Amino acid sequence: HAFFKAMLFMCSGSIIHSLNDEQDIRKMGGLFKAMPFTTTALIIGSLALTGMPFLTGFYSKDLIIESANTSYTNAWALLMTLVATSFTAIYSTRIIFFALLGQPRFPTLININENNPFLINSIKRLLIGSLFAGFIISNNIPPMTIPQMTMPHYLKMTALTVTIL
Amino acid sequence: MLKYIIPTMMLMPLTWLSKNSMIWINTTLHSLLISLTSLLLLNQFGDNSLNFSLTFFSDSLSTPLLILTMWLLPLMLMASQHHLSKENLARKKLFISMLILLQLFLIMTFTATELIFFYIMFEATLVPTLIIITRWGNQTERLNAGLYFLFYTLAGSLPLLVALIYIQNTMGSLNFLILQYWVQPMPNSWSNTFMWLACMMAFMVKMPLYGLHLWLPKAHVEAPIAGSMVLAAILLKLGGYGMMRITLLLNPITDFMAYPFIMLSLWGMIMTSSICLRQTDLKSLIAYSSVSHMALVIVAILIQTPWSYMGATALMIAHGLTSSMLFCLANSNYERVHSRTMILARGLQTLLPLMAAWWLLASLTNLALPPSINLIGELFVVMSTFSWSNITIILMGLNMVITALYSLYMLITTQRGKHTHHINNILPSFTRENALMSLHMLPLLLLSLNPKIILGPLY
Amino acid sequence: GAHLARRYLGDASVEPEPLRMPTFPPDYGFPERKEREMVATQQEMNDAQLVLQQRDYCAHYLIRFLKCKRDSFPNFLACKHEQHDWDYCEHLDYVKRMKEFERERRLLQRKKRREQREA
Amino acid sequence: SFPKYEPSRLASLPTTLDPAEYDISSETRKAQAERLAIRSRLKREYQLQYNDPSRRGVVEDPALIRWTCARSANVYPNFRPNTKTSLLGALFGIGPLIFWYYVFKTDRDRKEKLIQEGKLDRTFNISY
Amino acid sequence: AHIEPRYRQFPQLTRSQVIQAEFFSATMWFWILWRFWHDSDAVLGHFPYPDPSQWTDEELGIPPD
Amino acid sequence: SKMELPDYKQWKIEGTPLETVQEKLAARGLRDPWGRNEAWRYMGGFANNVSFVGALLKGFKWGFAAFVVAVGA
Amino acid sequence: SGYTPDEKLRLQQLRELRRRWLKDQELSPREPVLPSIFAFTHVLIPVWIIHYYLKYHVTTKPYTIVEKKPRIFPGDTILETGEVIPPMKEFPDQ
Amino acid sequence: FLPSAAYLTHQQKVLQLYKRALRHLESRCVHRDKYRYFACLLRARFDEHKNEKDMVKATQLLREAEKEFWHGQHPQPYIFPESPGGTSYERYECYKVPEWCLDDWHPSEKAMYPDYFAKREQWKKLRRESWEREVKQLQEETPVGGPRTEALPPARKQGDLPPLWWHIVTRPRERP
Amino acid sequence: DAPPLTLEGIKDRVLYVLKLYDKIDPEKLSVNSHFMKDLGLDSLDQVEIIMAMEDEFGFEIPDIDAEKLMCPQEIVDYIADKKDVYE
């Protein structure tokens, strides 16, 4: 989560400073191919959200819903986490569609500029940490719990099912 | 100790037999050398207090407060110019010598074995402070302020004398040790109830508690900076010192008879932190901050835990330093703009730029900054009162929330957002002001490093 | 599942209420079958610093995996199949717990309905 | 086409649907004319005492001073202790105090009874 | 040197930023594929999750009549 | 300095959502919108701006091949 | 409904004064104002001071820094004196 | 409630309702061209009875217009990042130092910047030169005893600057 | 964040986006030529013009100042007061 949203905020605020302090979803329309380093960055963030299988964002959320689904829980809480997984999928889809993949609404006299070694260094190295380093962490953790790992059908598939729907 | 008293005597004719434009340096240098020789006192160890010249002895209830007085004197001696530089030579010298005599009766009060000697030097602490605030108050209700001041402090503290004399001729002498080592437990008839209520009511007047507290804020906001700082820090923490001394008697009844003052103290703590949330007149907020802290101190003394006494004396010393400093910042803002109200002097982040650092630092020490001495005192008071009862922590934490809230309101309303751009008389900040900021916030951080000096004799 | 649905919608009888699992006596549908090997060697278990709620069955496999994972650290993906075997053994342990629950379920079902039919 | 937007103590009624800004009478426009005259004269004297190059101190705003003397110390004259004032006073002062007195007596009597039983959980309870 | 702002037209780009962007998208998709094919097959059940335990009456034993 | 300002007689609406919405508004019966202020928003380096699935398609155009390279390796 | 000529004129003279003020505000008098050592210090000097701090004074403090022990195995021996543990027993039923 | 007029007229009020509804339809409607469609539909609704002069039926329609505006307004209006409530709303009010100051400096640091302070001296001489007579006489001769407006007349009389210009000419750059 | 602004460049941009809007003529459209008095288009489309300038330059102009623009030169006056467009 830390690597994830550091990368996401840094990319989005870069876009904000590139496009004149507006920061709002409207009047921010068309940005894909307006240099796609940051649009690549933002959609890598939003696909690491909900855990595309199986990436840095996979491990945390998906082992959480597995171990929560296979325990003596409250029978409202698991349903709430499930529905909120669907909801985090849908607003991440909204931030993609309105920010980067729309017909261009933003005011003219445009000064789109990202010829910066600093920012390409920062975005570069944080997507590096957001593609491999989740596996570098999650691989050799000292195992300090007992994994469940024996799920039925429609309880390990439920993660990908909810995110796709 | 007598080597700490007699040069304060000889420091008094200094200002008299020094000529004009030369008195200032002399008084500053010599009172600071007295402050070094003051800090040389700290010999206290282990088993006993250090007792000599039979009237005199030092606990660690008395050593840190005594060093606090003998260090807060020259700070104040420097602090109180620019508002009487244009006054005359005679009244200037009289002001300075009156402060010195005030210091002398303060140290006589803090090293008092005999409690009658304590009471005499107590009202001797009273009598010059009225003359200071009433002659140089620089407002229009200062007269009524001094009048209320003296009648509250006397008429509360008057029957304390009769009770102490009754103790003197029903038991024997009033050495504090022979008050100790001999104290018989006194039962719960009604005369013992009145005697306890007499002594405790006198010092309840002095702290103040909640029901007798409008004594203070008029006397704070209508005073010069010297009288305001000595008044707040040294007088209220002197009242606490005296209560810490006299509570050693009448132990087996104060459990039965000391309930309702706890309730008055806590509900007054919440009401005081709420009344200083919404006032104008920036000067008054620090007075009500002082009333909040002293109500917490009174809770700490009515419970009888060593945790409570260590937190009590730490809270005393820390809030003396903090409230004295923040009074000095209030005086600096008022001498920038002759207003005394609050909302007129907005802005002041841009202009007077590093004044903001000292507002930040003083207000966070009021906030209970997370290693600060203020936090240490309030924390151990909260621990001890939770051991007293498991339900009191709501009022303590609600006090903490509102204390942080009015501290932050004072920070971001007086000194945040917009210069009102019709002002054009505020200068850059002088070196004297930043010197006083430094002289306030070096000892608080040094005590934040090694604080085991100043905790109570129940160590 | 559907057993959860039956336990909340239909009768509350035929589903045994959980975390009070042994109600039928042991060695009753067993007769004369218990070995329970448990070859973790309890002394070496406690001399190893495994956590509570890990001092469990199949723990020798975990000891093997900790041996290879200590002995080959900068090998990043060497130790696979030992932890795979530990996963498989605890899969069988979960299967055994499922067998216990459905044994108790079918005992309660068939026993109590035979009894409350003919009584 | 709306539920007509009731106000409250907080939800202030905006200037659109007053509907008092529709039946404009004579004294309404006379009041707006005199109100602009008041704001005009006050800004005139303000801008006179605001653009002076000889001006040193603050512009010495009288209305803030007046409100300060109002809120601070002109509370007490006038005041007569009426039924409303005294009843609300004895409620807001003594009420919560006597409430906290009862709850503290309750907890202290429970604690003294429980430790007089002998079975307080003082397994180690050192820092009292 | 550096770029210039133009008015109501699509601004030009350096080839370097677009080759890093395409490079990072490709490294993502290559990682998720090589991680998906070469090893696992991870989102599936990893085990034959059985039926109800054996569906065998009186194996595990039910001795009522 | 200057801006050099790509000027008028160039926008000339033709962009199919604005053209069809002027058709719909003509069928309504006004036939006078604002107009051609947004042809830069609807033609040029825009205009077959990609739909939603395409930025997620943007991986395998240089990634499937490297995957097959690592498979054959 | 719009301007009155007093507003127009007063506007114009304030435009001219704003011109002259802001054009005065850009100074350029052609002289406006006029009046691995890092790796060495930051990975050796606090390292030297702290390892001087972590042997002597802090080990004269008695219940100072304490390790949590490494976890031995039945297939382990001991580096210290050298004494072995009998290995783990039979595996079976895998 | 406005500087020059004592009150706003009804045509002005209808116009401000128009601008508010149009702004909130911008905020409501993405993609900007269906926005353009709905905006001309709204302009058609104001074309439906634009040419009527029953003033009492006009204000009846204005009341129902305020009702139909409040029924379907938008919760967070798209306000620009210098507007009231906006994303900046005097962001750099931090960096807006007034210009009565800057002269409480030190003469060494004053001698570091020669020409700007020489030109500032002649600005201040321009201020004190024509402050008293022309400005004060035009403000104590041409106004009435009750001023009854706030727009001050320019110095059309003879010479120097129009009256009371110091803190209005000398405002900062709003982006330093 | 570096937008450069000047007088004649923004005069060009205001005049350009008045030329692009359709129902005026591009023939008699001077730099200082009126809106209501000579072009003849009414109040409502004038405030749509004001909406266009606000939607282009990134700041609202108020309704107290919206009464009194009436020609492009006074528009360039008010915008140059807004962004302080001089050297």
Coordinates of N, CA, C and O in Angstrom, one line a residue, chain B residues 231-305:
Chain B
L231 N 3.6 37.5 39.2 CA 2.2 37.2 39.7 C 1.9 35.8 39.4 O 1.9 34.9 40.2
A232 N 1.8 35.5 38.0 CA 1.4 34.2 37.5 C 2.3 33.1 38.0 O 1.9 32.3 38.9
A233 N 3.5 33.1 37.5 CA 4.4 32.0 37.8 C 4.7 31.9 39.3 O 4.3 30.9 40.0
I234 N 5.3 32.9 39.9 CA 5.9 32.7 41.2 C 4.8 32.7 42.3 O 4.9 31.9 43.2
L235 N 3.8 33.5 42.1 CA 2.8 33.6 43.2 C 1.9 32.3 43.2 O 1.6 31.7 44.2
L236 N 1.4 31.8 42.0 CA 0.6 30.7 42.0 C 1.3 29.4 42.4 O 0.9 28.6 43.1
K237 N 2.6 29.4 41.9 CA 3.4 28.2 42.3 C 3.9 28.3 43.7 O 4.1 27.2 44.3
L238 N 3.9 29.5 44.3 CA 4.1 29.6 45.7 C 2.9 29.1 46.5 O 3.1 28.5 47.6
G239 N 1.7 29.4 46.1 CA 0.5 28.8 46.7 C 0.6 27.3 46.7 O 0.3 26.6 47.8
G240 N 0.9 26.7 45.6 CA 1.1 25.2 45.5 C 2.2 24.7 46.4 O 2.0 23.6 47.0
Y241 N 3.3 25.4 46.5 CA 4.4 25.0 47.4 C 4.0 25.0 48.8 O 4.2 24.0 49.6
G242 N 3.2 26.0 49.2 CA 2.7 26.1 50.6 C 1.7 25.0 50.9 O 1.7 24.5 52.0
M243 N 0.9 24.6 49.9 CA 0.0 23.5 50.2 C 0.7 22.2 50.3 O 0.3 21.4 51.2
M244 N 1.7 21.9 49.5 CA 2.5 20.8 49.6 C 3.2 20.7 50.9 O 3.4 19.6 51.5
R245 N 3.5 21.8 51.5 CA 4.1 21.8 52.9 C 3.0 21.5 53.9 O 3.2 20.6 54.8
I246 N 1.9 22.2 53.9 CA 1.0 22.1 55.0 C 0.1 20.8 55.0 O -0.6 20.5 56.0
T247 N 0.1 20.1 53.9 CA -0.7 18.9 53.8 C -0.2 17.7 54.7 O -0.8 16.7 54.7
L248 N 1.0 17.8 55.3 CA 1.6 16.7 56.0 C 0.8 16.4 57.3 O 0.8 15.3 57.8
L249 N 0.1 17.4 57.8 CA -0.8 17.2 58.9 C -2.2 16.9 58.4 O -2.5 17.1 57.2
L250 N -3.1 16.5 59.3 CA -4.5 16.2 59.1 C -4.7 15.2 58.0 O -5.7 15.3 57.2
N251 N -3.8 14.2 57.9 CA -4.0 13.1 57.0 C -5.3 12.3 57.2 O -6.0 12.2 56.2
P252 N -5.6 11.7 58.3 CA -6.7 10.7 58.3 C -8.1 11.3 58.3 O -9.1 10.5 58.5
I253 N -8.3 12.6 58.0 CA -9.6 13.1 57.8 C -9.8 13.7 56.4 O -10.9 13.8 55.9
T254 N -8.7 14.1 55.7 CA -8.8 14.7 54.4 C -9.3 13.8 53.3 O -9.9 14.2 52.3
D255 N -9.3 12.5 53.5 CA -9.9 11.5 52.7 C -11.5 11.7 52.8 O -12.2 11.7 51.8
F256 N -12.0 11.8 54.0 CA -13.4 11.9 54.2 C -13.9 13.3 53.8 O -15.0 13.4 53.2
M257 N -13.1 14.3 54.0 CA -13.6 15.7 53.9 C -13.0 16.4 52.7 O -13.2 17.6 52.5
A258 N -12.3 15.7 51.8 CA -11.8 16.3 50.6 C -12.4 15.8 49.3 O -11.8 15.9 48.2
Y259 N -13.6 15.3 49.3 CA -14.3 15.0 48.1 C -14.7 16.3 47.3 O -14.0 16.5 46.3
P260 N -15.5 17.2 47.8 CA -16.2 18.1 46.9 C -15.3 19.1 46.2 O -15.7 19.6 45.1
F261 N -14.1 19.3 46.7 CA -13.2 20.2 46.0 C -12.6 19.5 44.8 O -12.3 20.3 43.8
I262 N -12.6 18.2 44.7 CA -12.2 17.5 43.5 C -13.2 17.8 42.4 O -12.9 18.0 41.2
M263 N -14.5 17.7 42.7 CA -15.6 17.9 41.8 C -15.6 19.3 41.3 O -15.7 19.6 40.1
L264 N -15.4 20.3 42.2 CA -15.4 21.7 41.8 C -14.1 21.9 41.0 O -14.2 22.7 40.0
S265 N -13.0 21.3 41.3 CA -11.8 21.5 40.5 C -11.9 21.0 39.1 O -11.5 21.7 38.2
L266 N -12.4 19.8 38.9 CA -12.5 19.2 37.6 C -13.5 19.9 36.7 O -13.2 20.2 35.5
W267 N -14.7 20.2 37.3 CA -15.7 20.9 36.5 C -15.2 22.3 36.2 O -15.5 22.8 35.1
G268 N -14.5 22.9 37.1 CA -13.9 24.2 36.8 C -12.8 24.1 35.8 O -12.6 25.1 35.1
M269 N -12.1 23.0 35.7 CA -11.1 22.9 34.7 C -11.7 22.8 33.3 O -11.2 23.5 32.4
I270 N -12.7 22.1 33.2 CA -13.4 22.0 31.9 C -14.0 23.4 31.5 O -13.9 23.9 30.4
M271 N -14.7 24.0 32.5 CA -15.3 25.3 32.2 C -14.3 26.4 31.9 O -14.5 27.3 31.1
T272 N -13.1 26.3 32.6 CA -12.1 27.3 32.3 C -11.4 27.1 30.9 O -11.2 28.1 30.2
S273 N -11.2 25.9 30.6 CA -10.7 25.7 29.2 C -11.7 26.0 28.2 O -11.4 26.4 27.1
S274 N -13.0 25.9 28.5 CA -14.0 26.4 27.6 C -14.2 27.9 27.5 O -14.5 28.4 26.5
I275 N -14.0 28.6 28.6 CA -14.2 30.0 28.6 C -13.0 30.7 27.9 O -13.1 31.7 27.3
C276 N -11.8 30.0 27.9 CA -10.7 30.6 27.1 C -10.7 30.1 25.7 O -9.6 30.1 25.1
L277 N -11.8 29.6 25.2 CA -11.9 29.2 23.8 C -12.5 30.3 23.0 O -12.3 30.3 21.8
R278 N -13.2 31.3 23.6 CA -14.0 32.1 22.8 C -13.8 33.6 23.2 O -14.4 34.5 22.6
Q279 N -12.9 33.9 24.1 CA -12.7 35.3 24.4 C -11.9 36.0 23.4 O -11.0 35.4 22.7
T280 N -12.0 37.3 23.3 CA -11.1 38.2 22.7 C -10.0 38.6 23.8 O -9.9 37.9 24.8
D281 N -9.2 39.6 23.6 CA -8.2 40.1 24.5 C -7.2 39.0 24.8 O -7.2 38.4 25.9
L282 N -6.3 38.8 23.9 CA -5.2 37.8 23.8 C -4.5 37.6 25.2 O -4.2 36.5 25.5
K283 N -4.4 38.7 25.9 CA -3.8 38.6 27.3 C -4.5 37.7 28.2 O -3.9 37.1 29.1
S284 N -5.8 37.6 28.1 CA -6.6 36.9 29.0 C -6.5 35.4 28.9 O -6.7 34.7 29.9
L285 N -6.2 34.9 27.7 CA -6.2 33.5 27.4 C -5.1 32.8 28.3 O -5.3 31.6 28.7
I286 N -4.0 33.4 28.5 CA -2.9 32.8 29.2 C -3.3 32.8 30.7 O -2.9 31.8 31.4
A287 N -4.0 33.8 31.2 CA -4.5 33.7 32.6 C -5.5 32.6 32.8 O -5.4 31.8 33.8
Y288 N -6.4 32.3 31.8 CA -7.2 31.2 32.0 C -6.5 29.9 31.8 O -6.9 28.8 32.3
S289 N -5.5 29.9 31.0 CA -4.6 28.7 30.9 C -4.0 28.3 32.2 O -3.9 27.2 32.6
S290 N -3.6 29.4 32.9 CA -3.0 29.2 34.3 C -4.0 28.7 35.2 O -3.7 27.8 36.1
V291 N -5.3 29.1 35.1 CA -6.3 28.6 36.0 C -6.6 27.1 35.7 O -6.8 26.3 36.6
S292 N -6.5 26.7 34.4 CA -6.7 25.3 34.1 C -5.6 24.4 34.7 O -5.9 23.4 35.3
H293 N -4.3 24.8 34.5 CA -3.2 24.1 35.1 C -3.3 24.0 36.6 O -3.1 23.0 37.2
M294 N -3.7 25.1 37.3 CA -3.7 25.1 38.7 C -4.9 24.3 39.3 O -4.7 23.7 40.4
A295 N -6.0 24.2 38.5 CA -7.0 23.3 38.9 C -6.5 21.8 38.9 O -6.8 21.0 39.8
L296 N -5.7 21.5 37.8 CA -5.2 20.2 37.7 C -4.2 19.9 38.9 O -4.1 18.8 39.4
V297 N -3.4 20.9 39.3 CA -2.5 20.8 40.4 C -3.2 20.6 41.7 O -2.8 19.8 42.5
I298 N -4.4 21.2 41.9 CA -5.2 21.0 43.1 C -5.7 19.6 43.2 O -5.8 19.0 44.3
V299 N -6.1 19.0 42.0 CA -6.5 17.6 42.0 C -5.3 16.8 42.4 O -5.4 15.9 43.3
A300 N -4.1 17.2 41.9 CA -2.9 16.4 42.2 C -2.5 16.5 43.7 O -1.9 15.5 44.2
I301 N -2.8 17.6 44.4 CA -2.5 17.6 45.8 C -3.5 17.0 46.7 O -3.2 16.4 47.8
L302 N -4.8 17.1 46.3 CA -5.8 16.4 47.1 C -5.7 14.9 47.0 O -6.0 14.2 48.0
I303 N -5.3 14.3 45.9 CA -4.8 12.9 46.0 C -3.4 12.9 46.6 O -2.7 13.9 46.6
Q304 N -3.1 11.8 47.2 CA -1.8 11.8 48.0 C -0.8 10.7 47.5 O -0.3 9.9 48.4
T305 N -0.6 10.6 46.3 CA 0.4 9.7 45.7 C 1.7 10.3 45.4 O 1.7 11.5 45.1

